[PDB]
Each structure stands twice: as C-alpha cells, then as structure tokens.
C-alpha cells in the first residue's frame, strides 16, 4: 500500500524488506550457514514401519513473506528455507517422541516409558554407572543399541577410563561410548548431566505423508492480524506464503527397553 511506515503484523512473523527503523535491505547479501543441519534422531535410531493411511498426527507451518522482500531483499528465500523447515519438523518430532515435550500429541514417548518402568540411575558419569545403566537393559534380556546425549557432556565422558585396559572408554573421535554410538541432541530440554540408552529397534515410527510444500499468493491468513486487527489478505496486501505439512506416527513396542542416567 501507500503506507510509508511499514505494516506492523501480529504476530510479527511476516518477512519484510523494510525494518521498523526504516532501513531498507536493498542489494542484501545472502545469509550463510553458520551451523550444520540437525537430522531427526528417532528417524536415525528407530525402526521404520511401512504404513498405509493413518496412529498418525499432522505437523505443519506457514511462512508469510512480503513480496517486496521476495523481489528486492532475497529472491531465492523460499528455495533456501524449505530445508530449514524440514529441520524444524525433525526437531519437533524428536522432542515429542524422546522427551515428551512440546505438547506431543501421542500418548507414547520414551520419557513416559522410563518414568513408568522407573529405569533410572542416580549418579555421576563413571564406568561403573555406565555399566549399571547398560545392565538395566540386559537384566530383561534386551541389549543396548546406542546412546542419546547432550553434546555438552563430552567433557565428562573424556574423564572415564577403564582401569583394567587403562584406556578411555569414550572414543572422542568416533563419538562412541563403550563401543556404542552416541547421538547428540541439540534441544535445550535434555540437561547437561543426563544420558539415555535403549534398544531403539523397539521404537517404531511411520510417515504416511512425506513433507509436502505449497506456495500460495491468494489465501487469507486468519491467524495473522494487521495492526488494525483485520486478517491478512495475501492478494490485496501483495503478499506470499509457503505452507508445509507432514504426517508422522510413533509407536513404542516394548516400554522396558529404555533406561536413563541422571545426576544425583
């Protein structure tokens, strides 16, 4: 529109060419990847299950962009944002399935399995506590397959050495503990001193609908209010939006297959 102050949106999720202070991102240099992509950990550890139809639940998001931004500031925005959305979905799914966090829709999670079976070790990281953690699984004829850890505790793992072989139990190059691979979770909910392990083949997942993307220049975003409170009309307000959706399903076949180590 002829508005010389930029449009304030509520919530402020719309991408804009002009900042609130009047700065204009003309000739704007494309951002660069300061971090690597975080793959889904339950899609890495767990067992895939061929599934037809839906239990499943639907993930989704919408990204609105001001077409000024899409023309002058960053033309390829939607092509470079697609994988970042996929990462957001993987993180939401991992956080729901593992930690029972983020308003998970399933009634199932590893955190709930552990809280039910009380398979928790109070203690600092020591070779004896690692062996006890593993024995909590082998007690029930199940053998540990991998470890889940907050990367910030490698400082603790390097301090553990086998007093028989007199060598590090943790291979800091392989990132494997006692010969088992350790995967790192970037989420803020798993605390520094916490470690999880289990036979992840007992954790089953399915994906009835792979991540689908649709770009639209016409819809109305009921959820995004103009400053006056009217809903955003993409066509009249010269705006564009990307919709992404996915269906994921999670199942835990045996909830005693998981154990957790936590600080005393």
């Amino acid at each position: 529109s002829n508005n010389v102050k930029p449009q304030v949106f509520n919530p402020d999720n719309v991408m804009m060419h002009e900042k609130k202070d009047g700065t204009l991102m003309n000739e704007f240099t494309t951002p660069i990847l300061q971090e690597v992509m975080e793959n889904s950990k339950i899609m890495q550890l767990g067992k895939y299950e061929p599934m037809e139809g839906t239990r499943a639940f639907k993930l989704g998001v919408i990204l609105p962009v001001t077409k000024e931004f899409l023309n002058y500031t960053y033309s390829q925005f939607f092509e470079e944002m697609k994988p970042m959305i996929a990462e957001a979905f993987y993180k939401k799914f991992d956080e729901a399935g593992i930690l029972n966090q983020g308003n998970n829709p399933f009634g199932k999670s590893i955190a709930q399995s552990i809280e039910k079976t009380n398979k928790v070790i109070k203690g600092d990281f020591t070779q004896d506590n690692i062996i006890d953690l593993e024995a909590l699984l082998e007690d029930d004829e199940l053998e540990a397959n991998a470890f889940i850890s907050k990367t910030q505790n490698r400082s603790l793992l390097r301090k553990i050495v086998d007093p028989e072989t007199k060598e590090r139990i943790y291979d800091r190059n392989s990132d494997s503990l006692d010969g088992l691979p350790v995967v790192n979770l970037k989420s803020s909910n798993l605390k520094r001193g916490e470690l999880i392990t289990g036979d992840f083949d007992k954790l089953i997942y399915g994906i009835p609908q792979l991540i689908e993307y649709k770009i639209d220049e016409t819809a109305q975003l009921s959820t995004v209010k103009n400053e006056d409170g009217t809903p955003v009309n993409l066509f009249e307000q010269d705006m564009v939006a990307l919709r992404a959706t996915m269906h994921v399903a999670l199942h835990i076949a045996d909830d005693k297959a998981f154990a957790k180590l936590v600080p005393a």
Partner: protein, 466 residues
C-alpha cells in the same frame, strides 16, 4: 558478471607438489581444492552457461525494474548462442578423419570410434570448448567389458596437476549434488569421485560439515589403465571462451533495446492538444475520431468599465519523438563490435560476389580460421592422449599385440565450408579421375533406382546389338 568472469581466482590451474600417494594419504587437500572450485571457478562457469542459455543478466536482474502499471519489457538477445554454434560448427561440423600406416591400429581405432559414436562426442566437446573454454572426457571399461567414452560436465569436474614444468595430471575429481525431486536438505550433500592412476575412490560430503570426505561403502574400485583416465581439452592457452570477452557488450545491447521498448510502451504516440479557457463536454470529446470541423469559440471577458477582450484559444496535434539517428548509430556500433571481436560474419553489413560460395567464405572467415588453427593444435594434443589410453587398455586386455604403437596416427581435419559437387566432379573427372557407374549414379538424386538403372541400361545396350 565482471566480478565473476574476471576474478583472478577463477580460471586458475590447480597444482600439487606431492606425489599421488602424498595426496591420497592426505585426501583432505582434495577437500580444499573442491572448496576452492565451488567458491571461485564454478560461478564463472555458471555465468557462461547461463549466457549460452540466454538467461542474460537483464532477465534475472529484476532488482531495479518497475512494474506498478507499465510493462516490464526486459529482453535477452542470445548472441552467445549464435556465436558459439557458428564457431563450433565451423570447427567440427565436418568429422575428423584418421590415417595410419598400420591397418591393425587403424581398424582398432575405427572400431572404438564407431562403438562410441565419436563423431557426435567430438562435436559436443567442441561446443563445451566454445562456451566454457575447457572440456573434460572420461574413459571407463564398462561392466559389459567394453571401452566407453563419456563427456564430463565442466561445472563438476576438475584436474589437479603435477607441479613440475611437464605438469602431468596427478588426479581428477567429479562431484555432484545428489537430490530426490521432493525434499530438500541444508546439508548440501555432494557425492565425490576421485580418479587416480590406479583406481577410483568414492566419497560422500556436504558443505555444512566443511566438505569432510567420508569413504562410501565399497569406496575403492580398480581400473586397468596406467594413467589418470580424465582428459582436459582447452580452447586456447588461457582456456577462455568465445563470447566471454564480449559479454559486457551483449549486456549493453540488452539494456539499449529494453530502454527503447520502455519508451515505446510508456509514452503516448500522439495527442490532440487544445488550449485556452473553454468548455469541453467529455461526452462530446468522444466524437473526436469522426468529426470533420473543430470549432473553438474563445471566452469573452468583460471589464467593469465595459471593455471587452477575448481569450487565446489554440489547437493542434503533438506527437512523441526520439533521437533515432543517435540511438541507431549506437546500437549498430554495438552489433558491429560484437561480430568483429568474435570473427563472426556481420550479416547486417554483408554483400556477396557472383556465385562461388567457398572462396568468398574463406575470405570472410579468414580471421576465424587463425583462431581455429590453434584450437586444432590443442585438440589434437588431446586426442593423442585418448589414443594413449586406448592402446593401454587394449594391451592390458591383450585385444591387440603389445608390439603396436598408436602415436603414428595422423588426424586430418576438414572445415565445414560449403561445397559444390558439380564443380568437384568436373574437377575430378577432368585431370584423369575414374568413377564406377553405380557410384556416379548414386551422386545424382534424379535416379529413383540407382541400381535398377544398370539393368535397364543393359537391356537397352543389348537390344542395340540387333
């Protein structure tokens, strides 16, 4: 454009001081070369390719265009393709012929060429030479046990050479962004193949982890040659493309033409200007197209002391105009210069003598022939290596006697000039030539049955005996 085509880091020749073993043990250095290729050489090549496809700067640089109510009228002229196709056809439009003193080698070469359709392959290499300035070919012993030859794209292939003055090729690399056609990944994962003198090593990488090469399952695969299989061809010593040096002029011509198209779209051709204090009924103005008389009655002003005076009415057509002389002389200069610096015939300023196409062409293309002769030297230098590889694999498979030598082959080049079969027949049969009746008939397309005609002549020639 400029910042990518003329960057000092682009177009450089990669060199390595250590041996092949010194590299292969320290594969990370290959990672550094890959990164440098991506950050500097690839952009240049991508720009050259986009110009060959006609996606010139003027089409994609929408950043400073306007479209609030006028049309966009952005334009691209495709000079790059016209130039490259002309020069490449002139160089390799006519197949390279092969001569040798030993028929065993000659037929082994001809067998390999026919199997691999080398005629088309060579033409495609010549085209890559024209647009990118450099080209690569890969030779591999196939699963069906055949020697195959395939072109390797310039945007994904490079060679690391020995540091000595001889510059032997130490290792070649190919890398591709593998993708399905659905998801996308921020880990831009590249599959990387590293070719040594003794085998192919396969790895996986992504940009985000910093191109850490991780061996793929069944990483190594031996090959039976005794030198690195990839060969590089060059358009000239500098490896510069044919239109690379005139891209700026192509841009100037795009801009000039889109400027004229804006002037045409946005200004009204002509209008009837009417001045003075008057009453115009907007319903009556619509008769403007069909009225014959235009009557303007001026307002009369009355002074308080009784004086009377008339307003100044006026009317006449006005029409837009532009400096046709200066703009056409400028655009003609740009067109002329684009053709001059690429030795391509300026069709707009062209005249033809008599009827003999070939000699007039050899006059006008004299400048182009000078460059092509150098290209021909570098091309033969490449084909000799192709032959060296072929003889090595043939000997290791014992498909030919170890006694043979392939360096004796003579490569004969012909230009694609237009030729005149009637003048050539007259020049060949004068001066003592001979032709078999069936062949001579096969040259003229009025014979509907070139063989049946011989029987029909035997019949006539027989009844003529009686």
């Amino acid at each position: 454009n400029i910042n990518y085509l003329f960057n000092d880091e682009a177009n450089v020749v990669y060199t390595y001081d250590g041996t092949e073993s010194d590299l292969l043990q320290n594969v990370n250095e290959v990672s550094k070369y890959i990164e440098h290729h991506m950050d500097y050489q690839r952009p240049r090549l991508k720009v050259l390719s986009d110009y060959y496809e006609g996606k010139t700067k003027n089409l994609v640089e929408l950043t400073r265009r306007k479209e609030e109510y006028m049309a966009d009228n952005r334009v691209a002229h495709d000079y790059a393709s016209y130039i490259s196709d002309f020069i490449n056809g002139y160089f390799l439009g006519n197949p390279i012929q092969y001569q040798d003193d030993d028929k065993d080698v000659l037929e082994a070469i001809e067998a390999f060429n026919d199997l691999n359709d080398v005629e088309s392959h060579n033409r495609s290499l010549g085209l890559d030479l024209s647009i990118y300035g450099k080209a690569y070919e890969l030779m591999i012993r196939n699963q069906d046990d055949e020697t195959r030859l395939y072109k390797s794209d310039a945007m994904s292939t490079f060679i690391i050479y020995d540091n000595t003055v001889e510059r032997n090729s130490i290792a070649g690399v190919r890398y591709l962004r593998t993708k399905p056609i659905d998801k996308t990944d921020e880990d831009e994962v590249f599959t990387v193949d590293l070719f040594t003198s003794h085998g192919v090593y396969r790895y996986l990488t992504n940009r985000t982890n910093g191109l850490k090469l991780t061996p793929r399952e069944n990483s190594f695969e031996s090959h039976s040659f005794e030198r690195m299989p990839i060969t590089e061809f060059s358009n000239n010593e500098r490896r510069k493309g044919d239109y690379e040096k005139v891209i700026t002029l192509i841009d100037l011509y795009d801009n000039a033409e889109s400027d004229t198209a804006n002037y045409m779209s946005d200004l009204n051709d002509a209008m009837l200007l009417i001045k003075g204090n008057l009453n115009l009924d907007p319903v009556e103005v619509r008769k403007q197209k069909e009225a014959n008389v235009l009557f303007l009655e001026p307002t009369v002003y009355v002074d308080a002391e009784g004086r009377e005076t008339e307003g100044s009415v006026d009317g006449g057509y006005i029409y837009k105009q532009y400096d046709v002389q200066g703009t056409e002389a400028y655009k003609d200069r740009l067109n002329s210069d684009i053709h001059m610096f690429t030795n391509t015939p300026n069709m707009k300023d062209d005249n033809f003598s008599g009827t003999q196409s070939g000699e007039a062409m050899k006059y006008k293309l004299f400048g182009l022939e000078q460059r092509t002769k150098t290209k021909e030297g570098l091309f033969t230098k490449g084909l000799r290596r192709r032959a060296k590889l072929l003889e090595t694999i043939l000997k290791n498979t014992r498909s030919i006697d170890a006694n043979k030598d392939f360096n004796t082959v003579r490569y004969v080049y012909n230009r694609n000039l237009p030729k005149s079969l009637i003048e050539e027949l007259k020049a060949y049969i004068d001066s003592g030539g001979k032709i078999s009746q069936t062949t001579l008939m096969s040259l003229f397309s009025f014979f509907q049955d070139p063989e049946l005609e011989v029987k029909k002549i035997e019949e006539d020639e027989k009844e003529s005996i009686k």
